[PDB]
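Tokens as discussed.
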């Protein structure tokens, strides 16, 4: 049922860039781009929570062809125009230290993508992944814990749940549960898709809650910068009470490092009721109700 590896590295789909828009507003940190690709002329299909590969041009420092890099799909199965013709990505330009030889180092595939022009052809593989799928059950509770580009699979969920055109296109999924996104970014200009998330919470106050952790604008109770683990700690009891429901799913996505603090906070909440979270969590994972994609 789930589409997987309709295209592979040895024979990728050659798509075309339709658009490449900035998601970091003025005064933000770094570069994050929303990139939409044209799927017509191939049979790439996908669903929410999946990823695709991009193969960038060029050779590495050893003269070898650059390999596939994976990116979370940021559009629903229908694409952003709900026409089943496109796919979108949410791509950060990787750049970093002199402690790697040079000045700023720029990631190969992410710089290629963030600066790519409409009309350009791109090698696309996939889709891949079965561990970040949304339940078919419209009454499920969905907790979403995202930092940075980890917003990508959450966008596919929330758009399927809450976009008018999606609801009209998806007879069998009329979401009536409760979802709660905790989203960590450094600044308010760095809140990817801010306007549309806040629009969704406004329209569906009983079905969507939005919580920000903004490190350059907020301090945790210990006086440090506010991170997502701080917000999960602040709301640990609320989150644990939701997690106790047999129909609750939790999704974690972002750059690696968030999980440790999320676990310590939930562990303290569950312990009050004589539950060891690490054991409860293994069971959730086994049941397919604890989903993690970090990188
Ligand atoms: C399942 C999955 C989904 C992903 N989804 C997304 C997504 O939606 N959006 C997105 O932007 N990315 C996503 N990523 C990461 C993405 O695949 C690429 O790793 C990333 O874009 C960087 O690739 P590059 O080609 O730009 O960098 P490369 O040129 O491949 O450079 C990467 C290398 O630089 C180093 N490095 C990384 N960060 C630092 C740092 N600050 N300090 C020091 N060295 C560093 C390491 O050596 C790393 O191997 C995802 C990864 C996976 C596995």
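Sequence:
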């Amino acid at each position: 049922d789930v589409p997987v590896n309709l295209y592979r590295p040895n024979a990728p789909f050659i798509g075309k860039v339709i658009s490449n828009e900035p998601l970091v507003k003025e005064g933000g940190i770094g570069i994050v781009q929303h990139i939409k690709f044209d799927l017509t002329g191939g049979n790439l299909k996908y669903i929410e929570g999946q990823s695709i590969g991009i193969i960038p041009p060029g050779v590495d420092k050893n003269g070898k062809p650059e390999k596939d890099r994976d990116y979370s799909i940021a559009s629903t199965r229908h694409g952003d125009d709900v026409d089943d013709k496109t796919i979108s990505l949410c791509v950060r330009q990787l750049e970093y230290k002199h402690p790697e030889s040079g000045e700023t180092v720029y990631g190969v595939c992410s710089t290629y993508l963030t600066h790519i022009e409409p009309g350009s052809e791109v090698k696309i593989t996939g889709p891949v992944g079965k561990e970040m799928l949304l339940p078919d059950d419209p009454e499920a509770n969905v907790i979403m814990l995202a930092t940075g580009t980890g917003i990508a699979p959450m966008r596919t969920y929330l758009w399927r749940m809450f976009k008018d055109a999606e609801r009209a296109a998806n007879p069998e999924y009329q979401f009536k549960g409760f979802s709660w996104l905790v989203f960590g970014v450094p600044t308010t200009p760095n809140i990817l898709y801010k306007e549309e998330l806040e629009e969704i919470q406004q329209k569906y106050p009983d079905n969507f809650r939005l919580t920000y952790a903004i490190s350059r604008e907020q301090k945790n109770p210990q006086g440090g910068r506010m991170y997502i683990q701080d917000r999960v700690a602040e709301h640990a009891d609320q989150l644990w009470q939701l997690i106790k429901n047999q129909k609750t799913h939790t999704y974690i996505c972002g750059l690696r490092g968030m999980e440790e603090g999320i676990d310590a906070a939930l562990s303290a909440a569950a312990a009050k009721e004589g539950v060891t979270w690490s054991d409860y969590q293994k069971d959730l994972k086994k049941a397919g109700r604890w989903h993690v994609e970090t990188y």
